Symmetry: D2
Subunit: 204 residues, 4 copies
């Protein structure tokens, strides 16, 4: 989990990277964006960068898996959010002064160390996201999936298993299960104050 | 799909219903809200009422299934989003002047009339939410589920079947499949202009 | 479990029913077959009637579910095995003196009263056959299925759930689980000595 | 598919492997004319019956070994490694009937998922679902005996491989195979062939 300070740096970094990229058509050097980044940005974790304009979605791309360091993923996601979202036209430079940035940061996935019959009780609906990995098969469902679609812990484990391409009961037979959380930091005004949204799901 | 006019009427109904219930303690009569409602409100469709305060989630409750008329669904969902969301404290009367009201309206679910071999090509990821029905058993998944969790048509059909408590291949064996879409109307400001968000999914 | 006598009566009933049907062309009166029948024959349980000739399958029909009393189930399965097996022509009257009769009797299915956490431990592979029921959905898998296809308790419960048209994890969620056993009684010689085969499965 | 001649050689190989092992407590290979079919990789089961009752049966469903090797191993295990029965004594073989179930080499079904259910024949085909290093198989008698159509069979085999039931719909490889049974009508005597692997359909 990121502190308020780290959360603020996250959005500032996303905003900076985009503005830099919209100007010189090139991404900034990871450690030379003009934002102080604590060592947490070196951790491998997923993230999503959301852009809103006039209260409407303007673009959003992200890394669900911790395939990249937080730093790299923010850079890539932010530039992708403003220029690679096929649902929207590329954002122009002067548009950013009217665009609001949102950064959803996922925690480093940690293996739930329990026995098959204990797993349901260790999976918290509304807080946890899951990754099921067995052999070379891997699958994941974001935290909002379970609460927004009325799934209990047993349901969540089973759907994530099938998401991985495995049998729904794979978790019952010992499939490796990892859990992770998320947090959202967002601009209250362009380049302004940053607020934190604890809930990733709309409804539960 | 609701027109701008109807969408505006929907959000207004949500606000009024909440303000009235918060005022006294008796849910006003749906048609007796003071808000004009076209015949679209007599249609059976699912809905969600979302409240935000200062850019942060303040409450949200809904009924995804089309079991009540739009009018009644909004009514119930609105008061519940404000007083029955176990995630937040009850909304106080004086808080509504600082709250933004959002209303997500789902379309009347329509049966996909295609053989099992053709069903996947009928399901559009990003637009369609699904309902699988078999006898009295029924299950549904919101439109945003597939796009946000990298599921294709086949995955969505299989997952919705399991959500219904049925085998993942139930759709392959002729189980009924219904699809639906949604739209969001939200206040740019309390009791102010209402805009339309056509995207139910954050990312795809 | 049927006794040696009851089992002997089972085969004799099956054999006599056929010899009588083949001759006069009608089914004997259920209680005027010529074989003593204990009260076990009034219990609702499944059974199969097998006919072999010269060491080869000649016919086989049965009732997997306890839809009928043992008596009724045997008369019907016996006549069908001799005259209604689409894999073979109808048996001739002179053929019965060259045919061996086999009868597989299943026990009345009994609900396993255990929590999902206990279910796998209560299901004995190689002995138990399963029936899963949850509402109007019902499915069963014979005792030999699990041991012949290398399935453990967990696998067997999941496969029976899907057989019932339900999600594989239905048992983890509280779906009703019923177990049953079986035994085979067969003629060592035409209308001769009846021996009991305790294993319904070829391998395990 | 094995010829009748080969079918007879398979049961004799099974019977002799057991008598010899039961004699000097170990194994060779023989004295039985074996055609090249015994060098093919295919599953097999060896069954022993005595007095019309099962006396032992062990087998390898998957074609992990050549038929020859699978037969020797299965036969010896059927007589000395089946925990359901006590070990068979030397004197017992003269009163035991030998049965050998030989499965064909699994052949890939080359069709689109839409066509697979049409290619699977209930009653004849057994299935192996393969996706990477994950494999699963269900014997031919499974579908007809438990009232499963093609779709059911494909889905259950996918789960048997530890995969999602809809894996076959998503392109997982499917292989089909058949089997045949050759059995002794008399100890060390005549060998007939049972055409039906399923009890009931």
């Amino acid at each position: 989990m990121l502190t308020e300070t780290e959360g603020r740096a996250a959005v500032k970094l996303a905003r900076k990277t985009i503005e830099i990229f919209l100007s010189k058509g090139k991404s900034p050097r990871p450690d030379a964006s003009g934002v102080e980044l604590s060592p947490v940005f070196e951790e491998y974790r997923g993230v999503f960068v959301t852009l809103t304009e006039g209260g409407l979605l303007r673009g959003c791309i992200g890394h669900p898996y911790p395939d990249s360091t937080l730093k790299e993923a923010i850079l890539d996601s932010a530039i992708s959010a403003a220029t690679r979202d096929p649902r929207f036209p590329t954002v122009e430079q002067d548009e950013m002064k009217n665009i609001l940035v949102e950064v959803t940061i996922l925690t480093q996935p940690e293996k739930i160390n329990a026995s098959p019959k204990e797993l349901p009780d260790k999976v918290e609906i509304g807080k946890h996201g899951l990754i099921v990995k067995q052999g070379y098969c891997q699958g994941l469902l974001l935290p909002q999936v379970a609460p927004e679609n009325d799934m209990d812990s047993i349901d969540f484990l089973s759907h994530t298993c099938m998401k991985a391409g495995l049998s729904p009961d794979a978790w019952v037979k010992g499939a490796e299960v990892y859990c992770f959380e998320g947090q959202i930091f967002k601009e209250k005004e362009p380049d302004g104050e940053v607020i934190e949204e604890k809930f990733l799901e709309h409804h539960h």
